[PDB]
Amino acid sequence: MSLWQLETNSQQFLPRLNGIIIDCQVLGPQGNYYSLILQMTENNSNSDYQFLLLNASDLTSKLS
Amino acid sequence: QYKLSVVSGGKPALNNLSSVTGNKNIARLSQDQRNYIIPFNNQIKVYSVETRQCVKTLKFANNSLLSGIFLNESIVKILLGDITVAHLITVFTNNGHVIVLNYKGKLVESPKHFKISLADEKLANVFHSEGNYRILTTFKNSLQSYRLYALTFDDAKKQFEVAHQAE
Amino acid sequence: DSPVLQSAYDPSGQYLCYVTVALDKQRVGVQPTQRATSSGVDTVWNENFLYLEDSKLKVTCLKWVNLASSDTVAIILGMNNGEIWLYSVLANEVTYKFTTGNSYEIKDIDLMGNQLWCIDSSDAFYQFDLLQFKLLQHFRINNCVQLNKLTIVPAGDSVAQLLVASHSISLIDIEEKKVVMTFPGHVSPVSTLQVITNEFFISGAEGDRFLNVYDIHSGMTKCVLVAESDIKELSHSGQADSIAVTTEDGSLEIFVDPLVGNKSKKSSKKIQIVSKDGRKVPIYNAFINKDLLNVSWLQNATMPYFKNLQWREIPNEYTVEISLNWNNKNKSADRDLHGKDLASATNYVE
Amino acid sequence: LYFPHISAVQIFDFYKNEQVNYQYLTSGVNNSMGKVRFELNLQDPIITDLKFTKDGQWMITYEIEYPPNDLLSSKDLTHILKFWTKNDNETNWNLKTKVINPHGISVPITKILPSPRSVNNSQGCLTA
Amino acid sequence: STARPRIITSKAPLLPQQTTPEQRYWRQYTSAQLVKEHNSVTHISFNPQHPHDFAVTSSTRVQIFSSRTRQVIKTFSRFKDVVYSASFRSDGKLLCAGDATGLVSVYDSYNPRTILLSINASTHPTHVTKFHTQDNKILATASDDRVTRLWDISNAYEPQLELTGATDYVRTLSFIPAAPHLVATGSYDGLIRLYDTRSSGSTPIYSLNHDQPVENVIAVSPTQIVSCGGNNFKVWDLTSNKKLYERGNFNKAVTCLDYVENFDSPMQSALIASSLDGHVKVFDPLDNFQVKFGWKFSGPVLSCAVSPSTAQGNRHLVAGLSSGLLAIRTKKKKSNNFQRMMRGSEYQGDQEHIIHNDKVRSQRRMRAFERNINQFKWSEALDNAFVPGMAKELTLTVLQELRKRGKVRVALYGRDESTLEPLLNWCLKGIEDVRSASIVADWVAVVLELYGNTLESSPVLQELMIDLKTKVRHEIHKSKEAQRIEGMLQLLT
Amino acid sequence: AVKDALRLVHLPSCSVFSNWPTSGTPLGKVTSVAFSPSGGLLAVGNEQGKVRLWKLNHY
Amino acid sequence: KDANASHPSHSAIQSLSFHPSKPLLLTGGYDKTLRIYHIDGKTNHLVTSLHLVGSPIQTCTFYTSLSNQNQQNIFTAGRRRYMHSWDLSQTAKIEKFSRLYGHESTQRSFENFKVAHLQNSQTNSVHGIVLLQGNNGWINILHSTSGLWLMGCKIEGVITDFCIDYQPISR
Amino acid sequence: NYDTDFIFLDIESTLGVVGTSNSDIFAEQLHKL
RNA sequence: UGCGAAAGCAGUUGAAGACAAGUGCUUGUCGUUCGUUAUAAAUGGCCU
Numbered sequence A: 001m002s003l004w005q006l007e008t009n010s011q012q013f014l015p016r017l018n019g020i021i022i023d024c025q026v027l028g029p030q031g032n033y034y035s036l037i038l039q040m041t042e043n044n045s046n047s048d049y050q051f052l053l054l055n056a057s058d059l060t061s062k063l064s
Numbered sequence B: 001q002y003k004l005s006v007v008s009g010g011k012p013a014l015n016n017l018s019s020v021t022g023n024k025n026i027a028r029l030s031q032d033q034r035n036y037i038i039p040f041n042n043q044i045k046v047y048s049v050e051t052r053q054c055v056k057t058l059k060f061a062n063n064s065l066l067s068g069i070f071l072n073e074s075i076v077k078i079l080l081g082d083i084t085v086a087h088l089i090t091v092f093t094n095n096g097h098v099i100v101l102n103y104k105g106k107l108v109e110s111p112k113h114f115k116i117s118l119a120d121e122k123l124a125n126v127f128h129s130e131g132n133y134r135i136l137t138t139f140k141n142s143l144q145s146y147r148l149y150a151l152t153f154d155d156a157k158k159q160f161e162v163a164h165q166a167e
Numbered sequence C: 001d002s003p004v005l006q007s008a009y010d011p012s013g014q015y016l017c018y019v020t021v022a023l024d025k026q027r028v029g030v031q032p033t034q035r036a037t038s039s040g041v042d043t044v045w046n047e048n049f050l051y052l053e054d055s056k057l058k059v060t061c062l063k064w065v066n067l068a069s070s071d072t073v074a075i076i077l078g079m080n081n082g083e084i085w086l087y088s089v090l091a092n093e094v095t096y097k098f099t100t101g102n103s104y105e106i107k108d109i110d111l112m113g114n115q116l117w118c119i120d121s122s123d124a125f126y127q128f129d130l131l132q133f134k135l136l137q138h139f140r141i142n143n144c145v146q147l148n149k150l151t152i153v154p155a156g157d158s159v160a161q162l163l164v165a166s167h168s169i170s171l172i173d174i175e176e177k178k179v180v181m182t183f184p185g186h187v188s189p190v191s192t193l194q195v196i197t198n199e200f201f202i203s204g205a206e207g208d209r210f211l212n213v214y215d216i217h218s219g220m221t222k223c224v225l226v227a228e229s230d231i232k233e234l235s236h237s238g239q240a241d242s243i244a245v246t247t248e249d250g251s252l253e254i255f256v257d258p259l260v261g262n263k264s265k266k267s268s269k270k271i272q273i274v275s276k277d278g279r280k281v282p283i284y285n286a287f288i289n290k291d292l293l294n295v296s297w298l299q300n301a302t303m304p305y306f307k308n309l310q311w312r313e314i315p316n317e318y319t320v321e322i323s324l325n326w327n328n329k330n331k332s333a334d335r336d337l338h339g340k341d342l343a344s345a346t347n348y349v350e
Numbered sequence D: 001l002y003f004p005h006i007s008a009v010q011i012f013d014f015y016k017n018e019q020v021n022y023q024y025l026t027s028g029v030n031n032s033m034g035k036v037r038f039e040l041n042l043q044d045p046i047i048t049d050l051k052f053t054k055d056g057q058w059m060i061t062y063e064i065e066y067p068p069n070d071l072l073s074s075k076d077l078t079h080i081l082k083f084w085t086k087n088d089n090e091t092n093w094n095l096k097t098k099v100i101n102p103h104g105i106s107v108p109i110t111k112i113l114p115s116p117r118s119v120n121n122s123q124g125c126l127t128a
Numbered sequence E: 001s002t003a004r005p006r007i008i009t010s011k012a013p014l015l016p017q018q019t020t021p022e023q024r025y026w027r028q029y030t031s032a033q034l035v036k037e038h039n040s041v042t043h044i045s046f047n048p049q050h051p052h053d054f055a056v057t058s059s060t061r062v063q064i065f066s067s068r069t070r071q072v073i074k075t076f077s078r079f080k081d082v083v084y085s086a087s088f089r090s091d092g093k094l095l096c097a098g099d100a101t102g103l104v105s106v107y108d109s110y111n112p113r114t115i116l117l118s119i120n121a122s123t124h125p126t127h128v129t130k131f132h133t134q135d136n137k138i139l140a141t142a143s144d145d146r147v148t149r150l151w152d153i154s155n156a157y158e159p160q161l162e163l164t165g166a167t168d169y170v171r172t173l174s175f176i177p178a179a180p181h182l183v184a185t186g187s188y189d190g191l192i193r194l195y196d197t198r199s200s201g202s203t204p205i206y207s208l209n210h211d212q213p214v215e216n217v218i219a220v221s222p223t224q225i226v227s228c229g230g231n232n233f234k235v236w237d238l239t240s241n242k243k244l245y246e247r248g249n250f251n252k253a254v255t256c257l258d259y260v261e262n263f264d265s266p267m268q269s270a271l272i273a274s275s276l277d278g279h280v281k282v283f284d285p286l287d288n289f290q291v292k293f294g295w296k297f298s299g300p301v302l303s304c305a306v307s308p309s310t311a312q313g314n315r316h317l318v319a320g321l322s323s324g325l326l327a328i329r330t331k332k333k334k335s336n337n338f339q340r341m342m343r344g345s346e347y348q349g350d351q352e353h354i355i356h357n358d359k360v361r362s363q364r365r366m367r368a369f370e371r372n373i374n375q376f377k378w379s380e381a382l383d384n385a386f387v388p389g390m391a392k393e394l395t396l397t398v399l400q401e402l403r404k405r406g407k408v409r410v411a412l413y414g415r416d417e418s419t420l421e422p423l424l425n426w427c428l429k430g431i432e433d434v435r436s437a438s439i440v441a442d443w444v445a446v447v448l449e450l451y452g453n454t455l456e457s458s459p460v461l462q463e464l465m466i467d468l469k470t471k472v473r474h475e476i477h478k479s480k481e482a483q484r485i486e487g488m489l490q491l492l493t
Numbered sequence F: 001a002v003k004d005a006l007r008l009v010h011l012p013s014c015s016v017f018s019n020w021p022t023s024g025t026p027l028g029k030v031t032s033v034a035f036s037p038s039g040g041l042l043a044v045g046n047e048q049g050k051v052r053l054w055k056l057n058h059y
Numbered sequence G: 001k002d003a004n005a006s007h008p009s010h011s012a013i014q015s016l017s018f019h020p021s022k023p024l025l026l027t028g029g030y031d032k033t034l035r036i037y038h039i040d041g042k043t044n045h046l047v048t049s050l051h052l053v054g055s056p057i058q059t060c061t062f063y064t065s066l067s068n069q070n071q072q073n074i075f076t077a078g079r080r081r082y083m084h085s086w087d088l089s090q091t092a093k094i095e096k097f098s099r100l101y102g103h104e105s106t107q108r109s110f111e112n113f114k115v116a117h118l119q120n121s122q123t124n125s126v127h128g129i130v131l132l133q134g135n136n137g138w139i140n141i142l143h144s145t146s147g148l149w150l151m152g153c154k155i156e157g158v159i160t161d162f163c164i165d166y167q168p169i170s171r
Numbered sequence H: 001n002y003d004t005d006f007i008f009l010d011i012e013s014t015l016g017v018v019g020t021s022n023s024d025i026f027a028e029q030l031h032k033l
Numbered sequence I: 001u002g003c004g005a006a007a008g009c010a011g012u013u014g015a016a017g018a019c020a021a022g023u024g025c026u027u028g029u030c031g032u033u034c035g036u037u038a039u040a041a042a043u044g045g046c047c048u
């Protein structure tokens, strides 16, 4: 997941997520939490969705 | 002697519409931001963010209304608070069933069931900013088309009325 | 030593009002003693406080108004300014202020229904009516040089006699406005002057380990109850069924049937609080109704906590054990023991 | 409840109806990098069979590692077998032993049967 | 998110005789000094006390070596004829020695000038003089007179007891731990005789038959005694009075034997046994006395000893040779204003309510090749593989790692003959090894399929492949031959 | 840098107070200062690890 | 009475701070501990403590969100490349700021910092910012809650100190 | 399952099992506040 | 794609519509349909 800083076009990353990111969102009055949807495409038999709520402070999984 | 019963949960629900992007997640974080509501295919789980545990689970099988309605239907969105009226939630389904449920408590066997009147529409999205509610609905080149209606509650008739805005 | 300058349980024993100084200003707060309410809702810490807006102003005496008696819960506060404040906790605002003409500090206060009696450092009695909010009568009785305490004897539904003590105890008749009897008190100033039953009232003094039980009708010392260390607070159960005294060293002592060798009796049961680590937590107040005893201690700096125990089944010497933070390794719910994120998958290592 | 996900095991507690762990039991490009474009054609090793001994202290796992395409060794699947242990308090299985190409070369391990309690107090297994 | 997994080094299936934990420890006795003595060094003993100096008996003298300096610090040369022992006391203060004249002398250890007590034990040679471990005051001396007198230091004029019953030379004496009364002596008769000093004595309580001359008897434990004689050593249990085990791995006749217990090695107990074949081998009593390590020396070994359990310093293995050579192997073991300035670093929160620990442990530095793969530098990762002084195993992984990633052709696009030869050079060598043969097969296949045209125009590349063709052809013969062996080996079964 | 190196300046007169600090006031190597939002409390830290507290009677 | 008398500190008191409303005093130092005291003027007992392993406390400060008064937080920093935040009794909720979003070169240590209030005039919302002191005249401004990098200010020469002023415009 | 009951899994990822007074008003108000 | 072992043994990859480009004609495409079991290439690589 890449945070693009548009002022200078820089960026920060959170790599090695459990799966590819179907969706992203900024969830909070101040953007405290990021809500992400992951897919885990390894399993082709079924679609394996995982909902992740990350604390924007230190980018640690608040709720998986 | 033996008996069969469901025990555990299932895959998280998702807005399985190809056209919509950025609105796939239907889970909502409470106004007080102390717990997250996530709808599954067969239940709705309320997790406490601070402790990272499932404080409450609302099973469709236990409730008669939910059992009939969902057990195909799927929750298209959850809205915090109760539109009709501090821990109520409004659940909008694909067909149009609107259900007012309560978490952080005991699920009442008689929720405030309602039904928005739709003619050959599949409800895709609902949303609000301040007391004003607009609903997006899908109607049918393999490309689906959309109409945007205005939703309001009339107390006298205790029904949801839809007025056309856009297509 | 104790951050809680003064404390007082309500008559029912369910709520405690305590006063402490924040920065240079005294604040008054009320907390629920019981763990959970009757409905089953868990009690919560009450953030609301009443602040005194003047540093010089202080609370000298704290008295509860009977919850059942009056529609609005209230606690009566004596102030060194020379005026008495009636405080309604729910509103969190001082409803009304009784002001004596003089500026002398109030030393004590006692209440029976509408009847309210105080005393100042000038040794002047007063009578106040809560319902009418008026000063009835103010008088000074000769030979009472000091008045460190006041308690109104519970006779019927009216006040016919008052108990007052500075170093010796005196009984005074309101109508005659003269002393009726004199008792030999303590050498030090009297601190507690509660009336256990008819013709039997206890007495205790500052820096003293002895409690004198006197007879109102006769005037002879029935008994002298003795505590292991100095006595700070006193609570009596029923009608002399049991007496619990909070010693200054932080231990609670219970006297069982003190009104039944015979001259000098010692405490029967001793209660203490010690944390799991080993530190002792002093007890600053206690309440005992029929068979339940309530123990209040301070955690943090001024957070009060409470515990209810059945003193009848407790052994003679009992030490409650409480979990207080001490070298607690901080475990955050979103990390495991090794600091790794809980959502993260464990890697493969041969 | 242990689910043999592709190249991993997902440990799920059905009493509490919540996941308890997700462990990679295999080598391969699994979370080292994000596969993109032709890299996405790669197949990670597949955990085919997973079984526990009766006492529950030993975990037996069977893997099939698929070679990359367009090489000489693009038709020799590698069969791997592994033995893991953990104490009950711990939550991560630690690999204790690894057998490369059991039963010979390119011969799959069709069945695994942990031994009963009578034979070597449940510290044995059969592979077929 | 999760931390990046470390690249896992490739480990091929185990081969015979991996390095054992026991072999690793004993291999650390690295530093070797070879000292030359006048005559055969017959006996070697270690002081039971710090600094645990050891005494070597050579010719007509005794020399004590410092443990840290590994050099002579004291020499006892008063002895006129050949010497035969240098055992210390349990307290380590006293040193006793025997002489061919039969006189036994006791000296203050570290004080050669002073002579405490001199005893004329017998007119015959007195080969063995050992202090009693439980009781300090009593000395036992065994002589060619075939009587093992038990002297007392206070009374030197007459032996406290005189044990007899040996029909040949007695050259071995041992005191059983926890049984002070018991004494064990072994003669060249082939019998190990046990005596009870508490009783009247002079007649063995029972005899144990070895069938060969017994060169040394050591009491390994309170109930077990190991006796080495002839071409084997046997361990006996007194409670059963029968041999539990026997090992005859030796070729020449065992001479000396020593035992050390509860030392920081993986093996809790060790038994070093000289062979007289130049071999001293370590036996582990816990495992039925099986071999675990061995050394070889120039000539026959007549004495072996190890530092006691409580060495408290560098350990030592000492081997004695009949040529006089002594072999030693050793396992080596601001301003005050500025400190009042920053004084809080030492504190560890011993008094604080809550302790919070979030620092991540420092991981080992990653090598150059691992960094390139992590940063997706495919071509450079191949280069870092083929550099001088790169471990072969470490080189195999980056080759496998690239193949696993599916980046083999990608690593070989931007190359010419100049930067292709390092790969071919390694492939010329790695093709021999069984482990890297298959990986060499894949990579060489690609480079040919990718640089056929460049091969024609470049001569140097051609000679590489000619030599490579010879080596692979050589391997085909070896691989074929192994199959033929398997064919015959199947016929036998 | 040096001990007892604390002064209080009155405003807007910009005149330093003279009665306090004195020679006897304990301050040590003053390294941290803090005024309470109300009550006029003054807390002064020093290198010895002692936080000494004063009250300004005026507030 | 001394504040530290109840529970002494083992290192210099590098920073002090009074809570905006409540009667608490915070002390931090190279002892790597955050000791909070209940300043009553007569006893001064210790409310709590928090030992931060390997995190020297060069400065500390309370923070109360200007809009949501219920919000309380403690920011601390040292000669380290990370900052700590403590939300406000079995455990302590502590979060670590260690990401500068591409400006890592300009900032080597969080040791000098201050917290102020910023109004987003386009939305009229108010929130906290953490200000840091950079390598060469750089001042880095981070969102107090999310930790995002918002803007940077530069001056010529070596930056030595800075301070914040508010200027009301209207209601 | 090692108990008497049996667990089965469904393609919908559903694991089923087959097997054999003024104070009281004052208390409420204080909690509200 | 079917079956089978992992080796392999048999069998497919069609038609219509529309758009763009070039010159009614040629080619390429399809978030268009029917039927059968049925190269890539926007300088673009993973934090503290």
Ligand SMILES: [Mg+2]
Residues within 6 Å of the ligand: F003
């Ligand atoms: Mg000076």
